[PDB]
Amino acid sequence: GSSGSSGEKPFGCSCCEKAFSSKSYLLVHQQTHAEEKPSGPSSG
């Protein structure tokens, strides 16, 4: 249906469905995926 993207975001993450405006931002965001990864023994 009628659905658009807020602001020009030609940059879209690969792991998630997030989008940014400037690569720089997207990059820093990727760092998160390099930590607290979901793949774990399941220990609080």
Q: Is 16 in the site for Zn ion (CB under 5 A)?
A: yes
Q: Is 15 in the site for Zn ion (CB under 5 A)?
A: yes
d(CA 30, CA 9): 16
CB of 22 to Zn ion, least distance (A): 15
3-state secondary structure of 13: coil
Q: Is 20 exposed, middle or buried (0-12, 13-18, 19+ CB in 10 A)?
A: middle
Q: Is 26 in the site for Zn ion (CB under 5 A)?
A: no
Q: Is 19 in the site for Zn ion (CB under 5 A)?
A: no
CB of 1 to Zn ion, least distance (A): 25
